[PDB]
Design a protein around this ligand. Sequence first.
Ligand SMILES: O=C(O)CNC(=O)C(=O)O
Ligand SMILES: [Mg+2]
Ligand code: NI
Ligand SMILES: [Zn+2]
Length: 331
Amino acid sequence: AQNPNCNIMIFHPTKEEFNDFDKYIAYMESQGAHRAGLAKIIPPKEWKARETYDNISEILIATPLQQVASGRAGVFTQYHKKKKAMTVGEYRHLANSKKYQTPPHQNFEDLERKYWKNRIYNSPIYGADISGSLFDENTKQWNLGHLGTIQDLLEKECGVVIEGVNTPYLYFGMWKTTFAWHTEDMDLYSINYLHLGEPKTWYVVPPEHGQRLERLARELFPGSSRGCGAFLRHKVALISPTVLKENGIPFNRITQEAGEFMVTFPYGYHAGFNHGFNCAEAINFATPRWIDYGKMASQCSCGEARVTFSMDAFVRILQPERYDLWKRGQD
Ligand SMILES: O=C(O)CNC(=O)C(=O)O
Ligand SMILES: [Mg+2]
Ligand code: NI
Ligand SMILES: [Zn+2]
């Protein structure tokens, strides 16, 4: 078995290997990358996502989210308070302001220490989940707006034609902006490209050990657990590396820098934080190996998780028994 310790692997494809996206994902899995839940892909040196980032300031963040924390430094939840619209140029200035800017630090480990010590005492503002793309249309390799769609994969694998679309989303982050512990909708893959700015630190639990994280989470968030049998679908709970180590949960960590891709694998729980002003782009995708994970994915039916139009069909076809209850949650 490849990668039996489930370490995060880092890949350096050549320009020739960067042509065929599906093939390269399948290569990475042949080397055991999926066992970690997360992989890093450094593009060939010849590749670029677009020519420059000099003209992005007029993108609108229609609903910036202030991420307010409750709990203790290592075990907290966050809720998202909606703020007034602002442009990317306005947001970048805000991120760089004395109130929100990254503090002085020695290296990534020192910054990680400072994040875990102090996150809860601040409420950073995140521009998340903004439909759109920063890939140039002429970028033919690993262009996250040109991937094969999950609806087309389900159709290719299973023969059933379904409605729905699959488009990318932009994330504009600042120091301390936080992504809570989660897997993807329907335990899909995700791919994330850090277009610009400061790094993003990731934490990930190997898919084979995801239920260990879920059991810890039910212990640490006991009212949430009673409210919903899949409350991590709410994407609000944080658990620090120190707490994970205290409770014996297997995980790994890695920092993504500008110009790098990360891939999350089906049922790989992940969480993380931004180091400073940045912009990422991410999309879900599927492969043939995902289908079995989609069929088994947990679902939130309490009403909190509220998701895209396109998840309907996935539940309806892969999880017909759950469909009725899940749809009641959505309506
Ligand atoms: O970058 C972020 O805030 C969160 N991204 C992801 O969870 C992802 O790409 O799967
Ligand atoms: Mg612009
Ligand atoms: Ni994710
Ligand atoms: Zn729920």
